[PDB]
């Protein structure tokens, strides 16, 4: 066809090619042309002519006003941040200075600055630069506290709820509790004057904070209180955030039927309003992938994560913390899915990219590294055992040891000794020590893991079952403590039947462990019995696990808002 370009696109290419001479008069253009000039500068590769223009806060304020092309602004901004110029830090520092300067001005100028800060902080926290998003939200909060007017109280609540989302993503959990205390103080004195603000967003951020800190029971309580505060007038972003956080909170509490409809409604709301290529939609797919990766749904969790990564690889791609989180979450999911075959070339690649991005944009002692350095390690040992060279075996085992020890130290410093995450680190160390032929302290690691898991998650829980399964595999295969392995294997299969039924993936591993257990003690009739059970289990895995793409399983126009939340509330 070869249609000619419009006069708009031809004029853009006639202004960009004369940018350096008319850079002053471009800033006076309409806000919907200024973005097109700057996006053309990005497209031509003239990032330094562009990074010289986005660093000023006033120029970036009008660029942020174009909400239609925010999906292009995220790509442009992410292309600046890995180009070398630190646009995120510069904008935050400039906004902090301007807030500290106009703190003494009237209410209108302060309100305009607070709105500019809300949009800029929403963009920066949306782009993932959390450490450069506190300096904007903290300045907005400081602007809020000066005058005791009512809108100032409500916007201080907004500053606290948005700032709390930044710190949870930045893994500053110790300050999240103080931020929530400040927010609840502001909302208490808001309700003292006779009006109540909406508590859904704040309590959802509490749910995310406590689930990240692995306080599963209190996370469930706070997501209950969050979904008790959901109305139709809420923005769909807040609504879908609350549902996805509550869906994460429901899975760790082993209530999957509620989490099913919760995550289905969250994915539906994210797809209907935002779109199939939106970062919030990518976040909802990450939570959906977490849900599927928990309840036995592994052949589709990778497909969910690949869709989740491909959105973040396109909306804002390169070296970014959200892309790194998608790579890390996919790598563990690909590690689980591809575990049966034994090959790990792709999973290790997706784990290494998550390592190579977080180590570039975050400090080397940051918690998000710990949540990633495990995954690569969990792959390396699996590559290590399947290798054949002994030097390579030992080197990859020691590399996994270093990664697990660093992650364990970070988790122990952040949360503490008695937590689920530290117990998971202990279990990883125990299975690695089993892989490293050091079986004496492998038992100590596994028992330390189980005594912390069962104390917090109860005697019957998925993590407890997995840890005791690892301990039983240690006992029956290598430490020759066959008598103690039987009760642990029975506990593992019992918890698997209670939670996941007979379709659990680890049932194959524990049934093979039981086969080897009974072969050693010569009880051949039990060998025959569990061989028949294993064949039945394989048939079952071949029966109710059909090809059902979860991007389609969410359907279209399901139970809408005020219906899924109500059913979930009355289902308590």
């Amino acid at each position: 066809e070869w249609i000619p370009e419009t006069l708009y696109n031809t004029a853009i290419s006639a202004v960009v090619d004369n940018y350096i001479r008319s850079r002053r008069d471009i800033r006076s253009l309409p806000e919907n042309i200024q973005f097109d000039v700057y996006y053309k500068l990005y497209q031509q590769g003239r990032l330094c002519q562009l990074g010289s223009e986005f660093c000023e806060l006033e120029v970036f304020a009008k660029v942020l006003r174009a909400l239609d092309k925010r999906h292009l602004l995220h790509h442009c901004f992410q292309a600046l941040m890995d180009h070398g110029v630190k646009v995120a830090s510069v904008l935050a520092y400039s906004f902090s200075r301007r807030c500290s300067y106009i703190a003494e001005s009237d209410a209108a100028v302060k309100e305009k600055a607070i709105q500019v800060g809300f949009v800029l902080g929403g963009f920066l926290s949306d782009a993932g630069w959390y450490s450069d998003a506190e300096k904007v939200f903290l300045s907005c909060l400081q602007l809020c506290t000066l005058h005791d007017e009512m809108l100032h109280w409500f916007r201080a609540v907004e500053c606290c709820v948005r700032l709390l989302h930044v710190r949870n993503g930045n893994c500053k959990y110790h300050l999240g509790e103080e931020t929530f205390k400040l927010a609840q103080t502001y909302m208490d004195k808001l309700s003292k004057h006779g009006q109540q603000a909406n508590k859904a967003a704040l309590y959802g951020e509490l749910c995310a904070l406590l689930f990240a800190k692995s306080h599963y029971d209190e996370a469930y309580k706070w997501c209950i209180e969050a979904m008790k505060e959901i109305t139709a007038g809420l923005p769909v972003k807040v609504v879908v955030d609350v549902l996805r956080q509550a869906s994460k909170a429901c899975v760790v509490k082993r209530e999957f039927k509620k989490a099913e409809q919760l995550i289905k409604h969250a994915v539906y709301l994210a797809r209907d309003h935002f779109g199939s290529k939106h970062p919030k939609y990518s976040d909802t797919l990450l939570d959906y992938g977490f849900y599927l990766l928990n309840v036995d749904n592994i052949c589709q969790s990778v497909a969910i994560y690949q869709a989740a990564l491909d959105i973040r690889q396109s909306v804002f791609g390169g070296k970014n913390i959200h892309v790194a989180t998608a790579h890390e979450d996919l790598a563990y999911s690909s590690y689980v899915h591809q575990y049966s075959s034994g090959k790990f070339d792709n999973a290790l690649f997706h784990a290494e990219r998550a390592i190579g991005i977080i180590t570039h944009i975050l400090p080397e002692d940051h918690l998000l590294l710990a949540s990633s350095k495990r995954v690569k390690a969990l792959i390396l040992e699996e590559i290590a055992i399947d290798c054949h060279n002994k030097e390579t075996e030992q080197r990859l085992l020691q590399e996994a040891h270093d990664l697990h020890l660093s992650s364990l130290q970070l988790a122990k410093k952040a949360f503490g000794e008695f937590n689920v995450q530290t117990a998971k680190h202990y279990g990883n160390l125990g299975r690695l020590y089993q892989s490293m032929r050091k079986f004496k302290e492998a038992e100590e690691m596994h028992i330390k893991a189980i005594q912390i898991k069962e104390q917090l998650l109860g005697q019957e829980d998925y993590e407890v079952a997995l840890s005791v399964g690892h301990l039983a595999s240690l006992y029956n295969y290598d430490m020759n403590q066959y008598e103690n392995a039987e009760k642990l294997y029975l506990r593992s299969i019992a918890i698997g039947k209670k939670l996941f039924g007979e379709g659990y993936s680890g049932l194959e591993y524990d049934y093979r462990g039981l086969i080897k257990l009974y072969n050693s003690i010569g009880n051949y009739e039990k060998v025959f019995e569990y061989h028949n059970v294993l064949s039945n289990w394989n048939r079952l895995r071949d029966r109710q696990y059909s090809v059902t793409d979860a991007l389609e399983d969410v359907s279209t126009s399901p139970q809408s808002t005020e219906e899924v939340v109500q059913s979930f509330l009355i289902s308590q």
């Binding site: 890390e328 590690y335 575990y339 949540s371 690892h470």
Partner: peptide, 9 residues
């Protein structure tokens, strides 16, 4: 495949 899978990430 001696062992089960990793706990979580």
């Amino acid at each position: 495949l001696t062992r089960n899978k990793g706990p979580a990430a």
